[PDB]
Amino acid sequence: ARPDGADINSICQESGMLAVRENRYIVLAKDFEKAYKTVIKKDEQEHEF
Amino acid sequence: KEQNGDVKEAASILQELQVETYGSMEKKERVEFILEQMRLCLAVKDYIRTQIISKKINTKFFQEENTEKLKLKYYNLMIQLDQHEGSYLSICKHYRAIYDTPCIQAESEKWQQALKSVVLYVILAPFDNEQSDLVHRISGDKKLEEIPKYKDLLKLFTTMELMRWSTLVEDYGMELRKGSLESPATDVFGSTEEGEKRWKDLKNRVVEHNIRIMAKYYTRITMKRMAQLLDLSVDESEAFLSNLVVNKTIFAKVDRLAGIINFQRPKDPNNLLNDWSQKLNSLMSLVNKTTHLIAKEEMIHNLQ
């Protein structure tokens, strides 16, 4: 329910391969955030008007 | 070491295992430490706990020769992962890693347990080409043929030596009666929950490899005389038939409609193919006969 299929591919890219930068399997809920900050977040989060 | 550790300190060291391996760009202490809890997880006495920490171990490899002999220090534990309870066959280099240490040395008894471990383990291992081929690939040792037991079991690699099982029990129970290198015996039959289990899987060996070797004269063989020529009882042979036949790695055909049935090959249900091979190839051999008959008879007639 948070507006942050094509991105999910890069989502897992970022999150998983940074856990592999961390070099472990277990994927965290923070890994979502790691995949939700390097994205199309230009102008967060409402045209305000 | 406060209490020499416990499940609490096991959880401690484990939680401190997989966190720092990358905050600590470490090649040796990380190796000598990811093993440090191998006891705290084997003193835990849980096969799958050791296997989880080994799933951790897989991360670190090319461990060979960290120092000149750091692996002669770690491989004891690496094989200790599945040393006395592990799979009888996945010990290929596991139950091999024991030979090199006193092969690096010039030991006599420690090298003898090294040898009679690098060999007396595959008889536990199920049948395979690897075991069979390798145990004679590794043949050529000089310290190994100095053991009547090694010679005895190495001879077993042909005709199965369908021997009175108690005779082999002598040959490999007097290992514990060695006024010489005996650590072979303790590695083999100084053990109880696996050494006696080694005797059991040795019964498995004799019966199943005899099934292998005796596959020639079959298509006529009785359940009773099976046991008679098996060095084991009939209902013992019943259970052996049962396990080898539900394993069914070979295709026999048996029934107690008579009990005279055998660990057979497909029992020859085939058409002319048999006749075809026979007639054709035999007749061909006969034309070959003729064609060299002329030749060699002429040769022996050369002087005349």
Partner: protein, 54 residues
Amino acid sequence: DDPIISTHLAKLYDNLLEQNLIRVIEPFSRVQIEHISSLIKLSKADVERKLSQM
């Protein structure tokens, strides 16, 4: 709370029949119909007509 008691575990054990029939007949083609069904523990109760149907 079983919706139907005519099919649920009925079909399970139905499948299991031949699933247990490929363990007593898995070893060899020919066999005594008794000890082959000593595993199913009934040598002639229902093994007979079941395997016939099969």
